[PDB]
Design a protein around this ligand. Sequence first.
Ligand SMILES: [Mg+2]
Length: 121
Amino acid sequence: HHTQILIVEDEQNLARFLELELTHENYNVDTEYDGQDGLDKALSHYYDLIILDLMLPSINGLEICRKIRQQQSTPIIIITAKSDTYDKVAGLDYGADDYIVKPFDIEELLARIRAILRRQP
Ligand SMILES: [Mg+2]
């Protein structure tokens, strides 16, 4: 009944902050701090939207994005300190629906989540 979000982010302070802020907006949030654990969770459960850090232990977020896209059209937002156009283009072309440079303001993330989920059936 709740919208379900997965966050794969190894900086645990930010992961916890995003979880709290999204929960306050009535999302249900799962978090994983390891890239392999995050991919496994994304493939084994239905999420409405997945948020992926790029520099993660075990598996990089771009590889997580690619493996998810073999199996699912689930919306993905990449969050990362990699701000070069090269990196933005790579993430989007791997299947991400949006790409936000860290550090970012929570209100922008929430607005981009709403914009993406607006179009899902
Ligand atoms: Mg990281």
